[PDB]
Amino acid sequence: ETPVLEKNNVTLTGGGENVTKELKDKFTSGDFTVVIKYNQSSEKGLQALFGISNSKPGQQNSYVDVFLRDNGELGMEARDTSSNKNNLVSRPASVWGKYKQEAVTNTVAVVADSVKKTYSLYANGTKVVEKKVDNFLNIKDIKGIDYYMLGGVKRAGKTAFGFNGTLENIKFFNSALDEETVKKMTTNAVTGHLIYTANDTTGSNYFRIPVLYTFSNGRVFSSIDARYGGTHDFLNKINIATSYSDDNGKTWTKPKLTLAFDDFAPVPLEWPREVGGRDLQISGGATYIDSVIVEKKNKQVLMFADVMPAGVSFREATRKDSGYKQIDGNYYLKLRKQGDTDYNYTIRENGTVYDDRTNRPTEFSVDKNFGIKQNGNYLTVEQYSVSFENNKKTEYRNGTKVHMNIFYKDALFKVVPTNYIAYISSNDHGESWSAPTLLPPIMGLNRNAPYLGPGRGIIESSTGRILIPSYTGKESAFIYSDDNGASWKVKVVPLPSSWSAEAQFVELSPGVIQAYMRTNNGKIAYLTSKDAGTTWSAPEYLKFVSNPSYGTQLSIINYSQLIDGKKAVILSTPNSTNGRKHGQIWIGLINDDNTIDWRYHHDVDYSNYGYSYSTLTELPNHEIGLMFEKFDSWSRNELHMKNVVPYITFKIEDLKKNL
Numbered sequence: 311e312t313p314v315l316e317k318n319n320v321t322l323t324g325g326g327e328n329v330t331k332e333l334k335d336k337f338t339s340g341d342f343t344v345v346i347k348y349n350q351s352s353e354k355g356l357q358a359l360f361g362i363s364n365s366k367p368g369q370q371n372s373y374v375d376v377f378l379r380d381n382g383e384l385g386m387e388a389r390d391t392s393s394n395k396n397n398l399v400s401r402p403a404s405v406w407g408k409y410k411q412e413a414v415t416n417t418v419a420v421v422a423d424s425v426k427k428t429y430s431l432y433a434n435g436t437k438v439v440e441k442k443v444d445n446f447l448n449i450k451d452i453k454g455i456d457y458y459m460l461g462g463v464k465r466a467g468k469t470a471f472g473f474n475g476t477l478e479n480i481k482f483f484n485s486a487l488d489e490e491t492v493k494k495m496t497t498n499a500v501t502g503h504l505i506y507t508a509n510d511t512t513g514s515n516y517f518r519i520p521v522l523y524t525f526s527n528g529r530v531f532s533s534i535d536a537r538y539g540g541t542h543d544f545l546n547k548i549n550i551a552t553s554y555s556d557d558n559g560k561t562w563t564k565p566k567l568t569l570a571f572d573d574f575a576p577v578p579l580e581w582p583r584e585v586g587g588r589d590l591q592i593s594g595g596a597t598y599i600d601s602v603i604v605e606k607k608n609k610q611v612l613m614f615a616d617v618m619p620a621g622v623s624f625r626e627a628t629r630k631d632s633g634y635k636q637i638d639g640n641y642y643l644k645l646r647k648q649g650d651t652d653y654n655y656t657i658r659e660n661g662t663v664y665d666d667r668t669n670r671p672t673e674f675s676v677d678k679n680f681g682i683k684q685n686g687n688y689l690t691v692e693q694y695s696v697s698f699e700n701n702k703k704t705e706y707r708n709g710t711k712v713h714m715n716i717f718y719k720d721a722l723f724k725v726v727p728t729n730y731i732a733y734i735s736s737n738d739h740g741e742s743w744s745a746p747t748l749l750p751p752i753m754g755l756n757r758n759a760p761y762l763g764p765g766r767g768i769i770e771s772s773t774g775r776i777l778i779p780s781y782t783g784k785e786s787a788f789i790y791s792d793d794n795g796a797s798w799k800v801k802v803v804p805l806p807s808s809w810s811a812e813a814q815f816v817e818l819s820p821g822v823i824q825a826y827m828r829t830n831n832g833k834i835a836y837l838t839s840k841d842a843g844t845t846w847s848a849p850e851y852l853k854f855v856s857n858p859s860y861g862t863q864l865s866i867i868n869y870s871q872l873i874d875g876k877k878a879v880i881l882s883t884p885n886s887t888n889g890r891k892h893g894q895i896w897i898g899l900i901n902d903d904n905t906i907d908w909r910y911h912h913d914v915d916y917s918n919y920g921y922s923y924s925t926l927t928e929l930p931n932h933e934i935g936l937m938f939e940k941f942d943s944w945s946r947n948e949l950h951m952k953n954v955v956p957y958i959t960f961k962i963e964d965l966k967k968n969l
C-alpha cells in the first residue's frame with residue numbers, strides 16, 4: 311500500500327507550503343491516513359502539520375487538519391461549513407517538545423475510516439486515541455475542498471495555524487491503514503524511553519508513581535503502580551510492577567507483577583475519557599499502591615507499599631482502627647467473620663486464627679500471602695473480570711478460582727477496612743522476593759497506618775538508621791529502624807496544615823538530614839534533623855518553586871560526585887501555578903554551614919508540557935536517571951492516558967544550566 315504523496319525535509323517558519331497540485335482530488339474514497347515525522351523549532355501557538363480545506367471566503371469551517379499545542383496535545387479537526395459538523399478528536403500529552411536543549415523528532419499519524427466512522431491518532435508508536443463520531447466527515451464529505459497544504463490550514467485565503475519546524479517525512483495515503491501498520495510506522499527513538507507500556511507483561515493499560523533506585527552491584531531497578539481501571543487512585547485495582555537494567559539504563563527487563571492481588575484479573579481496560587464517563591471506577595479490587603525502595607547495609611533490598619482491601623478508598627478508610635488487637639503484649643492482625651458485627655478473631659503464631667472470645671485456635675489459618683485455609687486446605691473464591699463495550703462497564707465472576715484472601719470482598723474472614731503498609735525483601739537484588747510483612751500498628755491501636763511517600767528510603771550514615779518517609783494527612787511520619795530492619799518505629803511530627811506530605815530524605819552531613827515534602831500551600835517544605843531523625847525543626851520552604859495548593863510528589867537524592875567542589879543534591883519537581891507542568895531538575899550544593907546553594911536548574915521539556923510524579927537515581931556511571939509522569943496527573947482532562955511515564959538519562963553537564 312503506497313502513498314499518494316510523500317515529501318521529505320520541508321523546513322517551515324509559519325508560512326506553510328502549497329501542495330494542492332500534488333494532492334488535488336487524489337482522495338478518491340474520502341478516507342485518509344497521514345503519517346508525519348517532524349520536529350518543532352518553536353512550540354508556541356496552535357500549529358497544523360497539514361491542512362486540507364475549502365479556502366474560499368465564508369468556508370473557513372471546511373477543513374481537515376492534524377494539530378499540535380504548546381502542552382504536547384495532539385489532535386485533529388474535520389469540519390464542514392454547510393452541514394455544520396465540527397469534529398475534534400485529541401489526547402493531551404501525546405508528543406515531546408524538546409530534550410536536552412534540542413527539538414525532539416516525533417512521528418504522528420491520523421487515520422479516518424468511513425466504514426467504522428472513527429478517527430484515530432498515533433504518536434511515537436502509541437495509538438493515543440480512537441473515537442467513533444456520529445457526525446463523521448471524510449474528505450469527500452467536506453464541500454468544495456480546493457487547497458491542500460503543509461504546515462498550515464488555508465482559511466479564507468489566509469494561512470492559519472502556521473507550523474514552525476521541519477517535516478522530516480510526510481506521507482499521505484488515500485485509505486485507512488490498519489492499526490499495527492501505523493503503530494510500526496510511528497515507532498521511533500521516543501518509543502524506546504518507555505519502560506512500562508500499555509498491555510505489556512503487566513496486563514495494565516495505565517501506570518503511575520514511578521520509582522528508580524540504583525543498587526550497590528550496579529543494577530538500576532524500577533517499580534511503578536500498574537493501575538488497571540484508568541489512572542484513578544481509588545477505587546481501582548493497582549499492583550506494583552517492577553523492571554530492571556544491568557547496563558546503566560540502556561535496556562530493561564520485561565515488567566513483572568511484584569506486589570499483586572488476584573481477586574481481580576490484571577487486564578487491559580479501555581477506560582473512558584469523556585466528561586462524566588472518566589469519573590467511572592470499578593467496585594474496587596484489593597490494592598497495592600505507592601512504592602518505596604531501599605537497599606540495606608547488607609545488600610538486602612526492601613520494597614514497601616500501601617495495602618488497601620478491596621473496595622476501600624483512602625477517603626473512606628477508617629482512621630480510628632489499626633486493624634490490630636493487643637493480646638498478652640503482642641500485636642495480632644484482627645479479623646471479622648462474615649455475619650459477625652465484632653472482630654472476634656486474631657491471626658496468631660503460625661498464622662493460626664484464634665477465637666478471641668475463647669482464646670483457642672479455630673480450624674482456620676492464614677498463610678504468609680494472606681490466603682485462608684480451613685483444616686489445612688485452601689478456601690477459594692471466584693476472580694472478577696471487568697469489561698466494556700457498548701459504553702457499559704460490567705464486572706463479573708470470570709471462571710478462575712483463586713485463594714480466598716483476607717483483603718478480598720468475598721472473604722469469610724476480613725480485615726478492618728483501612729490502609730496498611732507491607733514490605734517485602736529480596737536477597738538477589740530484585741529477581742525474587744519474600745512474602746509480605748504488614749507493619750505492626752506503630753501509630754497506635756486506634757489509628758490507621760501512615761501513607762508512604764513514594765520514592766526511596768535512606769540509611770543515615772553515622773548511626774545506620776533506616777528511614778522510610780510517610781504521612782498521615784496532618785503529620786509527617788518518619789518510619790525508622792535502628793536494628794537493620796528487624797523492627798520498626800516512628801517519629802510523628804505535626805504539620806502547620808493538612809499537607810499530603812509525601813517526602814524524600816537527603817543527608818547533608820553525618821547525623822544531619824532533611825525531609826523535603828509536598829504541602830497544601832503551593833511551596834515545597836523541608837524539615838531538618840541534626841540527630842539522625844530523632845527530632846525535627848519547624849518547616850522551611852524553597853523560595854524558587856511555586857505550585858498550586860494541591861501540590862505534587864517530588865524526588866530528591868544525594869549525588870556521589872563533587873559539583874563545583876561541593877557535595878550536591880538533585881531535586882526533581884514541577885514548578886507552575888497553572889498545573890502539574892514545567893518540570894525542573896535542580897542542583898543544590900551543600901554549604902559548609904549545611905544550607906544549600908540552589909545554583910543550577912534544567913527544564914525538562916517546554917514549560918506548558920505536563921510533569922507530575924517523578925523519581926531520580928544516580929546511575930553507576932554517575933549519570934542521572936529520571937522517570938516521570940509526562941502529563942498532569944491531577945487534571946481531570948488528562949486521566950486514563952496510555953504510555954506517558956518515560957525514562958530519560960542526563961549527564962551532569964546537561965543539568966548544570968541557568969547560572
Ligand SMILES: CC(=O)N[C@H]1[C@H]([C@H](O)[C@H](O)CO)O[C@@](O)(C(=O)O)C[C@@H]1O
Pocket residue numbers: 356377385387398
Ligand atoms: C484546534 C482548535 O482549538 N480549533 C479551534 C480554533 C482555535 O481554538 C483558535 O483558532 C485559536 O487558535 O478556534 C475556532 O474558533 C476556529 O478557529 O474556528 C474553533 C476551532 O475548533
